[PDB]
Swiss-Prot record, chain B:
Binding site residues for heme b: 106, 397
Gene Ontology cellular component list: azurophil granule; calyx of Held; caveola; cell periphery; cytoplasm; cytoskeleton; cytosol; dendrite
Primary gene name: Nos1
Record's protein name: Nitric oxide synthase 1
Domain-related comment: The PDZ domain participates in protein-protein interaction, and is responsible for targeting nNos to synaptic membranes. Mediates interaction with VAC14.
Binding site for L-arginine: 169, 278-279, 283
GO biological process: arginine catabolic process; behavioral response to cocaine; calcium ion transport; cellular response to epinephrine stimulus; cellular response to growth factor stimulus; cellular response to mechanical stimulus; establishment of localization in cell; establishment of protein localization
Complex formation: Homodimer. Interacts with DLG4 (via N-terminal tandem pair of PDZ domains); the interaction possibly being prevented by the association between NOS1 and CAPON. Forms a ternary complex with CAPON and RASD1. Forms a ternary complex with CAPON and SYN1. Interacts with ZDHHC23. Interacts with NOSIP; which may impair its synaptic location. Interacts with HTR4. Interacts with SLC6A4. Interacts with VAC14.
Residue numbers of the full-length protein present here: 299 to 716 of 1429
Transcription in keyword set: no
Post-translational modification: Ubiquitinated; mediated by STUB1/CHIP in the presence of Hsp70 and Hsp40 (in vitro).
Subcellular location(s) of the protein: Cell membrane, Sarcolemma; Cell projection, Dendritic spine
GO molecular function, one term: calcium-dependent protein binding
Keywords: Calmodulin-binding, Cell membrane, Cell projection, FAD, Flavoprotein, FMN, Heme, Iron, Membrane, Metal-binding, NADP, Oxidoreductase, Phosphoprotein, Synapse, Ubl conjugation
Function (record text): Produces nitric oxide (NO) which is a messenger molecule with diverse functions throughout the body. In the brain and peripheral nervous system, NO displays many properties of a neurotransmitter. Inhibitory transmitter for non-adrenergic and non-cholinergic nerves in the colorectum. Probably has nitrosylase activity and mediates cysteine S-nitrosylation of cytoplasmic target proteins such SRR. Inhibitory transmitter for non-adrenergic and non-cholinergic nerves in the colorectum.
Species name: Rattus norvegicus (Rat)
Length: 411, 407
């Protein structure tokens, strides 16, 4: 079956055959679309077909499908599964797998970069101190003094579900949030629960507006342990505006490295519950969501006051005016400090080219419009006008529950 | 089977039961979501009539009454006899209002119950249609104090006697392709404009030429009529800060009046059912003015603002976009023509959603369309999970008449 998608601005029509390779469910049915819903122990039974599907993919990609090396690998994996109930990926397969999980991430606008990903194999790691060391190295490598490089660090896979490696932080670098007795929040409201956990675990909070959170690291199903990332490895950018000199006085800064550390990487039926990865920021992540979300730093008003906008009526679009200048400031600040960042115009323009390339060479490109379209200036980006098909391919990154909700405490 | 939607900004959770009454299909499957795709007999008829009459009589607290059963058998008799049936005025009004209520792509639905329904089922000719349309236009425009309305022409019979308005909106600007290669006026309306011209329209070949109506009655060939200019309320666009803005020569019309959709009620099809409300500012400022395939004036405005258009990272497009939308809202408000900004409208819609979940068990909503085309995440709807499903009565798309018309 062939599915077509149209760009209504260019009239470019693309044909998707790749969706036929999709096995996982979407959440939607013929009777309901759940496109805007945020989030809608394994036996050898189901494991070998998942292994086999993956190895077929891997061997095709290297143009060795049906080769003796291919057949021997399947044989080897089958025996390892049936005798040990799981299996180990080769380094090559792991790298391929991690790149392809990124390639298949339908919510990622940055996928033009998918083939350039530094894979750090941390499957020999056994302790939290070991994890801390690997994470420091990842951060140093990825930061590269401002010339950001995409990377992922992969810790040992799940076994019985009782010995999971987990990074309890949602991102490797993130600011603390503190609920005040008066109901207000100091720092990042998104991180209040996690901050409370760290504090309970013994973290001494400075209690400021931009305190880099400690790492809370779980190796092999043991209770998680606290580590402070060397401050010298945490690159931060003071936010100023190229025209508004009062902007610096808002006291804003942000960190340079976005490094998501709470997702699950699935490759060939194997589950990597700790696989922190990092690229670089699109400006709106910080300027629109992090700064201007009502449930985050929420600085729109303070900014709009300082610009002396008419704030009596929303129809002045004071919020829209303030939002733009803030986003200008984020981009200006990162560029001036030579920290990698991309604006949403560049990023979405590159995504369209990527997506067209993928349709040609791959027969498709799963894309979640709801997430690909930037949170400001939507229709003046080309992706707004692009029809997209969302489906699930493996390897993939998946959500997993927060570890404090499932962890069995050892004491 | 009972579905929850969450608002991630306010933590409000609503439970949807209304989707279970859904009948039509979405285009999506368990294996693929098509949420971003723009367009994904007597025996057929009586269950449809029945489903509709059931909800009608339930809405007036007479479910399972004598009058309900009576109406049900009367319509039943009429279907067996005539192969169709006719809605009572009360049923027609209920159906039209609910078609709007059910329009998952409409952010303005808090107004759904305040709709003026004009019954034009007695209409037989294009001149008749013209008259009804002028009346609609005058009524809805109301000297700038806009009122929602729909005019309903006779229903489809055998598909050979369709009433159709060929225009996509009652009021729209012409588009002409130049020898210069570019496009004068509205590029969206190039094809329709040509059809007017080959049907006899004498175009002024200007930038903002109000198109003439092309009206088809009873499956006959369509005819041209000029809407009396005096009924077409237009707004010169100026900026409350930039004096040069007026020099751009921009204007827009006050009345958004969609005329090409199909209204389905109780299995009956109304192929000509133009309706109108009032504008949300971004439709004009963001889409009409800034879309590349529309009037595409961003560059010109940016230049007038003297912005650094060297690099995209200066966000000059975003700066210009905001000012354009400021001008639009400012101009309409200054001339006392009803308009709503995207902040006010989405905030209203959140309240409507909660009303509908509370009083009806749900509200079908298409996030891709409900989230405005600028400043998305600073409006509440961005953080609102929505379930999209198809309820009837409904407004549907239908093919452009010129591809279907046996001339
Ligand atoms: C290199 C530059 C990159 C850019 C500019 C970029 C951009 C983005 C953005 C803006 C989002 C939306 C995030 C949000 O709104 O929360 C996203 C999502 C995502 N990205 Fe990328 N990304 C990059 C690299 C990567 C890498 C290296 C990976 C993995 C190896 C990745 C995997 C993902 C995944 C799995 C999501 C979905 C997250 C979720 O569902 O919560 N991205 N990306
Ligand atoms: C009264 C003020 C109203 C406002 C502010 C409003 C707002 C909107 C907006 C912004 C859209 C998106 C349209 C687009 O982007 O092309 C829309 C779509 C729609 N509206 Fe409303 N509307 C109003 C009145 C009405 C009325 C009176 C009806 C019918 C009786 C209606 C039925 C629809 C339908 C069926 C759609 C989907 C159009 C499509 O699928 O192409 N609206 N509305
Ligand atoms: C629970 N809530 C409110 C919630 C949780 C996660 C999300 C999405 C987090 N996605 C973050 C994410 C993931 C991968 C990325 C890759 C690159 C980049 N620049 N940013 C990236 C950002 C949204 C809401
Ligand atoms: C096929 N293409 C290019 C295409 C067709 C229809 C559309 C959407 C047309 N619907 C416009 C529309 C419909 C109903 C409305 C009701 C009120 C209002 N203010 N605007 C309204 C605007 C977009 C693109
Ligand atoms: C409810 C809605 O799905 C939710 O707010 C989504 C919308 N689109 C998004 N898009 C991106 N990139 N990131 C997000 O967090 C969200 N949030
Ligand atoms: C491809 C995509 O579905 C298309 O551009 C949609 C996106 N959202 C929209 N939303 C509204 N309100 N109106 C539109 O025309 C569109 N266009
Ligand atoms: Zn869907």
């Amino acid at each position: 079956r062939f599915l077509k998608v149209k760009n209504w601005e260019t009239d470019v029509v693309l044909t998707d055959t790749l969706h036929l390779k999709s096995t996982l469910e979407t959440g939607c049915t013929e009777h309901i679309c759940m496109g805007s819903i945020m989030l809608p122990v394994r036996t050898k039974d189901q494991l070998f077909p998942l292994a086999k599907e993956f190895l077929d993919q891997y061997y095709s990609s290297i143009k060795r499908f049906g080769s003796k090396a291919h057949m021997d690998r399947l044989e080897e994996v089958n025996k390892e599964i049936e005798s040990t109930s799981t299996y180990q990926l080769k380094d090559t397969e792991l790298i391929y797998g991690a790149k392809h999980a990124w390639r298949n991430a339908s919510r990622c606008v940055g996928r033009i970069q998918w083939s350039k990903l530094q894979v750090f194999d941390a499957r020999d790691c056994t302790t939290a101190h070991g994890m801390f060391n690997y994470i420091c190295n990842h951060v140093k490598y990825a930061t590269n003094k401002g010339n950001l490089r995409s990377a992922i660090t992969i810790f040992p896979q799940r076994t019985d579900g009782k010995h999971d490696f987990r990074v309890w932080n949602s991102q490797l670098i993130r600011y603390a949030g503190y609920k005040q007795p008066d109901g207000s929040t100091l720092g990042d409201p998104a991180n209040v629960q996690f901050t409370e956990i760290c504090i309970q675990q013994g973290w001494k909070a400075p209690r400021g507006r931009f305190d880099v959170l400690p790492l809370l690291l779980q190796a092999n199903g043991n209770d998680p342990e606290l580590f402070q990332i060397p401050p010298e490895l945490v690159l931060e950018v003071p936010i100023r505006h190229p025209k508004f000199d009062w902007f610096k006085d808002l006291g804003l800064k942000w960190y340079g490295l976005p490094a998501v550390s709470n997702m699950l990487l699935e490759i060939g039926g194997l589950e990597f519950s700790a696989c922190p990865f990092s690229g670089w920021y699109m400006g709106t992540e910080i300027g629109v969501r992090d700064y201007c979300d009502n449930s985050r730093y929420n600085i729109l008003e303070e900014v709009a006051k300082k610009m002396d906008l008419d704030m009596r009526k929303t129809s002045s679009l004071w919020k829209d005016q303030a939002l733009v200048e803030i986003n200008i400031a984020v981009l200006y600040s990162f560029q001036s400090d030579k920290v990698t960042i991309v604006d949403h115009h560049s990023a979405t323009e590159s995504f369209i080219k990527h997506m067209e390339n993928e349709y040609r060479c791959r027969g498709g490109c799963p894309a979640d419009w709801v997430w690909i379209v930037p949170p400001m200036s939507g229709s003046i980006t080309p992706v707004f006008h692009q029809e997209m098909l969302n489906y699930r391919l493996t390897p993939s990154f998946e959500y997993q529950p927060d570890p404090w909700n499932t962890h069995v405490w050892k004491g």
